Design a protein around this nucleic acid. Structure first.
Ligand SMILES: [Mg+2]
Ligand SMILES: [Mg+2]
Ligand SMILES: [Mg+2]
Ligand SMILES: [Mg+2]
Ligand SMILES: [Mg+2]
Ligand SMILES: [Zn+2]
Ligand SMILES: [Zn+2]
Lengths: 49, 33, 67, 100, 183, 36, 137
RNA sequence: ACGGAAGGGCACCACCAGGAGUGGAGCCUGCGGCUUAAUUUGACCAACACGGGGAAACUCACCAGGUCCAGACACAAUAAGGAUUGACAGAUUGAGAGCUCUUUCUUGAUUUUGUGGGUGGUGGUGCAUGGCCGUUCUUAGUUGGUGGAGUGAUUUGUCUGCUUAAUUGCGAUAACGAACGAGACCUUAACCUACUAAAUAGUGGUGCUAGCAUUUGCUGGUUAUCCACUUCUUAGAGGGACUAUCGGUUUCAAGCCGAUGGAAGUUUGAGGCAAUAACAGGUCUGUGAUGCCCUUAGACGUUCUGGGCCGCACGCGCGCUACACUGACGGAGCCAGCGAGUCUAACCUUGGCCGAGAGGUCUUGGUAAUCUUGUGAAACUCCGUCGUGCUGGGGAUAGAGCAUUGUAAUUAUUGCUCUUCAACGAGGAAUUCCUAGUAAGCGCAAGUCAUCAGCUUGCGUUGAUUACGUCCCUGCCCUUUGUACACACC
């Protein structure tokens, strides 16, 4: 019913929105590039420069 | 049996005794008095 | 440019209005007195206020200034 | 007695110093010997992203940061002055790992 | 690791924030510390709701058995008023009046969307003094953006409360341009 | 389209979990029981 | 005693000690800096005041951090500042000022490190100010 | 508000003096066009290496096929001789697919059937929306109180003129006093022989010492080997610049220009934040954000195989590599910074052996200022080969072989070895970016990643030319002005 999806863009999703595109796979985020832009301050990520 | 396993792993999603919050893809289920 | 805004100029004028028998025309002994007679919340703004007050009191000895 | 190394890490510099200064005086009030608090360089976790949730507009990039800070202090003391001292640093936001 | 561990702790805090925002909205939740405007709808039947919430968060996050001026509260309250039915202008006026009389030095409430099916104007309501660009917006400004879901479209509720800096009690207490001299 | 025609009113192998109710299929040489 | 010298990101730490005219740069002597064209850029804070002028001091510099030219300027500033500091402390400040006059009247960042640091690059173009090429149609 | 009305002012997204170029060549990639079963789709200054969109499967939304329900829940029935489930041995299919059949076993109130009601949708609508961006805006503009002018709506304040990056300030002045914006603020980059503390950073001196020289000194290693220290490094609290001082010009000042000193004198350099607002700008293909419409059991839901997004009469844009001697090719010198890197585990890889190489291999350190890593980067510098040739410049195109990544490299992922060696003799009309550690040249790290850069985000090595002005061009702002517009020129 399902073939292996252990790698590639299909293996990972946004932990919030589950969108397979723009995923931030850095520092162990696993969050969308827009969902992180939304919930960035609440993680501890802020803008200074 | 196939339903008892989950009805005891807990401690039908519509009838009641299941209040479901989603909160990032995790289906938080809680029963009611 | 090097033009000073109102929150510099007006604070300097207010300092010179009541502290003429006070801080001289030298910036080093101007900012120090500013530190204790003004609630400046940043050293850069304090430096601006003290420099403009130094300029005001340096040109005060060449004729009275408006306002 | 046992020799230990306490490691203090946080994003909040104020409470990080609130523990790095509390620990020094809490060891001086018991008159111990300790290597000074060493401040490992801050890791600036800069992360670029696109402001646009789509692909329209001028190409404008926006970086975020969660600057992480960490220190380390080594000393030696008995077990009671180890546990009662590791129970002082519970400042919410600063994480403390005590190794032996 | 520690960089990854603190990133995961921030992610965990975000998860808690969103979970309690969705769960305890009708209880008046404001922010995980938790801090709510009401601490009775959470305790419930002498610990019932709170213990059930702890059980759910524990089971999700793999834990062991033992391991007034709020902008978001105002936004949730006026969203609840708009959802049980009330004039948009009246709810915004009430929330702005309450925030301005509760010690805050400024408030602004924007409601955008399909009030009545139209070009979706943006109705703003601003009262008091309000700061903009600068580190002061992080110091003393609280913002809350909520999505109201009526039968026709979605309404964007923005609430900005500026607390009086003089009663700061932590951090800078005046404005960077505020100057007060003695004589 | 699995239909399971009504099957009106009515041996065994190893893996003794089978409770003597796994009667084989008699087509030819069908030593592969119903379960397997 | 010890001084340092920087041009962009290189730092050259110099130790000046009482000795006999030993000027080491990386373990090799000052004559083997090997820019092969800036080898007279490291002889500036010696040739300037007096060509030989010095058999009493030993300058041991070690430079790390930048590039070839940056580190050559760093060492040529480090030996200069080391000489200045040694004269100020031990020999006399009159003579340290009398050689500081020559260093400043030939100033090529010998005594004062250059302030020009790499300006950060901004999104939407390679380089800090240079922008990507734009097409209207 | 608008104008196919005008005047001042501002800006290397404008120019002037210039540099680098682009457009001319090959290739990469995006868009169009054409084709296709599909070549998915959004976007036309502010689309066109943009959707973080570097697509083999997945992504995927496209096409050719095949599954599956993940259709709950009041029901009405089927159900207590059984509603429904699954299935080996073969037809069948790409499929070890019970899809279906040849076909007879299995389970057992979960379903299946129809009224009814739901769930999901990368289906539509960004001209129904929220949120978020983009643009106006690398712009300076916006608004009360009291007073003045108007019957009034309103106006002045908010301005002739100088000055500033600035509605910045001076100043003129029925305004005075202010508020938002700008500034201030915050982050970072410069400095501090000052404080503080450091074999997770570094430096000397004692032993451990191998060379060289030997009157004791050069380079040295001494990762559990000795003490002291904080100059370099690090990070906390502070200091420091405020154009300081002096001259010239300042209408009367705001300021501007030189010199001295200063670490830093252009808002000290670069950013973050960015008022009232306007767009029918983009995004429903980010969202378990969502109105309506559509679809919902041969599905537009989900899933599997395969192909497509890449396809080539051609046009356009962003780019990489060149046309060579300031160069190519070889040995030689061995010079950074920003970072990232694995405990349910295969991430960053040091050190040996093999191969020519990619790479294989036995290990080791690193959850980290500790190990890669001193990222022994590249350009560059030294000496030689080339001798000015379509050449030994250039590596497009194609042939053969070896590995790596991946279930799967064919439409070559990429790397490596050998081989034919295309245009290109510096680029037309046009046209882009930019004023100092900046342009340009150079590579490195990170993101996208199982693999793959010609892309982007940051970073450092080398470091110029010209200018310090202006309204000739473009864009924008303000003011004036006309209006039969006010849903405001759609
Ligand atoms: Mg600002
Ligand atoms: Mg990409
Ligand atoms: Mg679909
Ligand atoms: Mg007006
Ligand atoms: Mg494509
Ligand atoms: Zn997301
Ligand atoms: Zn069996």
């Amino acid at each position: 019913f399902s073939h292996p999806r252990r790698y590639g863009k299909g293996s990972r999703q946004c932990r919030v929105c589950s969108s397979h595109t723009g995923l931030i796979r850095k520092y162990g985020l696993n969050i969308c590039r827009q969902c992180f832009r939304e919930k960035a301050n609440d993680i501890g990520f802020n803008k200074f420069r | 049996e196939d339903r008892n396993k989950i009805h005891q792993y807990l401690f039908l999603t519509s009838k009641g005794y299941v209040k479901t919050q989603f909160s990032w893809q995790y289906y938080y289920y809680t029963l009611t008095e | 440019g090097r033009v000073r805004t109102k929150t510099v100029k007006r604070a300097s004028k207010a300092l010179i209005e009541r502290y003429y028998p006070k801080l001289t025309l030298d910036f080093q002994t101007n900012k120090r007195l500013c530190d204790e007679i003004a609630t400046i919340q940043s050293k850069r703004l304090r430096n601006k206020i003290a420099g403009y007050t130094t300029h005001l009191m340096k040109r005060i000895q060449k004729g009275p200034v408006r306002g | 007695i046992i020799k230990i190394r306490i490691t203090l890490t946080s994003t909040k510099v104020k409470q990080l110093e609130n523990v790095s200064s509390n620990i020094v005086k809490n060891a001086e009030q018991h008159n111990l010997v300790k290597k000074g608090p060493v401040r490992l360089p801050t890791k600036v976790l800069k992360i670029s992203t696109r402001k646009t949730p789509n692909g329209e507009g001028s190409k404008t990039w926006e970086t975020y940061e969660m600057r992480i800070h960490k220190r380390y202090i080594d000393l030696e003391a008995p077990v009671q002055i180890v546990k009662r001292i590791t129970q002082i640093t519970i400042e919410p936001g600063v994480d403390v790992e005590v190794v032996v | 690791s520690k960089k990854r561990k603190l990133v995961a702790d921030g992610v965990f805090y975000a998860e808690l924030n969103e979970f309690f925002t969705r769960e305890l909205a009708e209880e008046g939740y404001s922010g995980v510390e938790i801090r709510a405007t009401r601490t009775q709808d959470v305790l419930g039947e002498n610990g019932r709701r709170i213990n059930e919430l702890t059980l759910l968060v524990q089971k999700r996050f793999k834990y062991a058995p033992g391991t007034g001026l709020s902008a978001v509260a105002q936004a949730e309250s006026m969203k609840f008023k708009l959802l049980n039915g009330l004039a948009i202008r009246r709810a915004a006026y009430g929330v702005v009046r309450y925030v301005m009389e509760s010690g805050a030095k400024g408030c602004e409430v924007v409601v955008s969307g399909k009030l009545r099916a139209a070009r979706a104007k943006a109705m703003k309501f601003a009262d008091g003094f309000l700061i903009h660009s600068g580190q002061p917006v992080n110091d003393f400004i609280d913002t809350a953006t909520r999505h109201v879901l009526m039968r026709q479209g979605v309404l964007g509720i923005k609430v900005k409360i500026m607390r009086d800096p003089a009663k700061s009690r932590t951090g800078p207490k005046a404005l960077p341009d505020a100057v007060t001299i003695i004589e | 389209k699995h239909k399971k025609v009504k099957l009106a009113v009515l041996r065994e192998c190893s893996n003794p979990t089978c409770g003597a109710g796994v009667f084989l299929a008699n087509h030819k040489d069908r030593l592969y029981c119903g379960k397997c | 005693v010890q001084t340092f010298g920087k041009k962009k990101s290189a730092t050259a730490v110099a130790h000046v000690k009482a000795g006999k005219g030993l000027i080491k740069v990386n373990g090799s002597p000052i004559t083997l800096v090997e820019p092969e064209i800036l080898r007279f850029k490291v002889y500036e804070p010696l040739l300037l005041v007096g060509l030989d002028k010095f058999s009493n001091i030993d300058i041991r510099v070690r430079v790390t951090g930048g590039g070839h030219v940056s580190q050559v300027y760093a060492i040529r500033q480090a030996i200069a500042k080391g000489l200045v500091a040694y004269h100020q402390k031990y020999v006399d400040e009159q003579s340290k000022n009398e050689l500081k006059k020559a260093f400043t009247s030939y100033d090529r960042t010998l005594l004062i490190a250059d302030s020009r640091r790499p300006e950060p690059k901004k999104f939407g173009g390679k380089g800090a100010r240079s922008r990507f090429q734009k097409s209207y149609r």
